[PDB]
From a paper:
Here, we study fold transition between distinct β-barrels by protein engineering and structural biology technique. Here, we discover that the previously reconstructed ancient DPBB sequence could also adopt a β-barrel fold named Double-Zeta β-barrel (DZBB), as a metamorphic protein. The DZBB fold is not found in any modern protein, although its structure shares similarities with RIFT and OB. Furthermore, the reconstructed OB fold could also be converted to the four-stranded SH3 fold by a simple circular permutation. Thus, these ancient β-barrel folds (DPBB, RIFT, OB, and SH3) could be readily interconverted by a few feasible mutations through the missing-link fold, DZBB, indicating their significantly close evolutionary relationships.
Author numbering:
A (entry chain A), B (entry chain A): 6 to 55
């Protein structure tokens, strides 16, 4: 199934640099990750194999 | 730019459940995340806004 997490906080976001975000997975687990530029609190990201 | 991380270790993987993995982002940072079922060490995942 799809692995998605909601952006809870943007912790550190330099210009032209991907931010550090704290995200919450659908099981309720919260973790720090790197997320694409432009993401904001309340957005959702997917972790997908490439 | 794209945010990708290489799967370094599968820490916990129940059947029919997404595994806990330790991944390494392109800047060298390592973090625990949830990754899709079927991912194995050496695969690459992308974090993408949906």
């Amino acid at each position: 199934k799809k692995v998605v997490a909601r952006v809870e906080e943007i912790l550190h976001d330099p210009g032209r640099t991907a931010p550090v975000a704290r995200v919450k997975f659908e099981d309720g687990t919260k973790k720090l990750i790197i997320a694409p530029e432009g993401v904001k609190v309340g957005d959702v990201v997917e972790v997908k194999k490439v």
